């Protein structure tokens, strides 16, 4: 709110990000009058530059951006050895507990529940795990696998948090050589195949997995990795070794394509593909 | 020879098994009892085989693979893909027709109060599709592949969570009804599936729809407009749409003997169980 240094107000802001996928919040002015002057120019390009890439897109349509980054790290991955797996969106309230995610725990209060037994999955290690085990029983090579799709949780309305968003988990399992190098690998498999080849791993807290490596661009997390702990498989007492990591689809393409925030390349009605669309 | 499989065996057979155990007869209980024991192994058997096999050639996942396969076919024919979100309101399923007296109200999984897992692709489709009309004067045509969910009966091709592919053109060049048997050709073309029947039904939503049918199982519904749930969502002109299972699709291509196999799965990978 400087009256001396004078930027859009934070309502400016947000109207220009609205429909608008440029960068707004650095520059100065002299005075209101001109910040002012400025605004108006700024908008009018940002809404005029929206309603021409609306209409490009409906005359020349394209696979949706999500699904197509969805296409490209899929490829990647499989060239790699790796198996595509789906499995379902419920998960039980015993897988939950399983991972440590119970009463008491932050993550708790984040989940749908769709019954006194089964939620929407806020993760896709608890499935994917399950599935890594049973392959594992059919082969005695390494099992490697991802899984694409739909998690859910309650989440505070922050910068680049959607209720409903897009994961991509890949897990190994089985024989080791040096674990974090081959981890290192597949991080750099996707994220060259997703178009972001620049990017740094920082370690971070974590209440799950205790020690996470986390992928950043700019400051922000995209994907956070781990050699696997071994609570979720508590009907075992011997563990096969194994390690993933879990990258925020949108959160890749909403960073690729400077989308202006995070819920315009994902699943929505009012965007489509970066455009606003009322 | 009258003597066929029970129902607990034949669902028995079908866990590990793909063959069609429908059709054998047996002189008497002795020797349906005897190939039943024969058959299920060999079930068993092919089963492991297939699964070794997928883990010696990884691949991508046979439901992403049809659903790469139609939306591909879908964008060549000047098809928008869309992705819309899981949750709708109670408010958009009231304007279907989907009110709290109407019995297909309980099939309904609910999140809150005022929102749910969308049992349909139609509520955010007609959303969308209207809200593009808004940016131009040609055929908006637009497509959607995703989870829907449904409570419902055994699994007689039924899952809880099962993928639609819902497309729809809103304002055709052409008649509607004509320019959707076109689309539904494409999709099912597109599907490996180029053999299948049009037949008009029966729905508690639309009134009327026209199915796609392959030896009588239903794989698709579909609808033209103008329509009477048109006005609640501000719809006022000719469209057609069509939604399909896709999973049934990959279920009836592959000769899978149940629809839980070519799906999501914590117990089945590309139509051979895992566990
Ligand atoms: N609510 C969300 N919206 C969008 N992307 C998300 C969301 N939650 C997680 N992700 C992404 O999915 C990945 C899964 O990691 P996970 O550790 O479970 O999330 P997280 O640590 O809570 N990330 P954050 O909430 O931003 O601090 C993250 O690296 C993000 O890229
Ligand atoms: N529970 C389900 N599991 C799998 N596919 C489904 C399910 N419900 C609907 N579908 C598929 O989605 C398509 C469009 O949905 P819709 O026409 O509303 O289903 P429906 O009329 O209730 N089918 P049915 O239950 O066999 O009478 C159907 O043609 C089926 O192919
Ligand atoms: O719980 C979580 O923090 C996420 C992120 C994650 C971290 C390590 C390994 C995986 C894996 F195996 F699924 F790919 C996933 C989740 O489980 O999806
Ligand atoms: O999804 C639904 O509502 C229908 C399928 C359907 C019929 C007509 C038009 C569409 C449309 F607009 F989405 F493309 C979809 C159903 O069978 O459930
Ligand atoms: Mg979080
Ligand atoms: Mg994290
Ligand atoms: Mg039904
Ligand atoms: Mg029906
Ligand atoms: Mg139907």
Known sequence: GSHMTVKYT????????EYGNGTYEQKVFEDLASRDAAFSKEMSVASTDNEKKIKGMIANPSRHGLTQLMNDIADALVAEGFIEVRTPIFISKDALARMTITEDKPLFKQVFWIDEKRALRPMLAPNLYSVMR???????????????????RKESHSGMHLEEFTMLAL??????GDATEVLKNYISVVMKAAGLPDYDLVQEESDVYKETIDVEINGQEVCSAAVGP????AAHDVHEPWSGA???????????????????????????????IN
């Open 230 to 233: 071994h609570y979720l498989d």
């Open 134 to 152: 049973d392959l594992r029983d059919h082969t005695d090579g390494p099992v490697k696998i991802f899984e694409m799709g739909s998690c859910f």
């Open 10 to 17: 934070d309502a400016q802001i947000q109207r220009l990000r």
């Open 246 to 276: 879990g990258f925020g689809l949108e959160r890749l393409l909403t960073i690729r394509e400077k989308y202006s925030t995070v819920k315009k390349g994902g699943a929505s009605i009012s965007y489509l593909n970066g455009a606003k």
């Open 171 to 176: 897990a190994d399992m089985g024989p080791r």
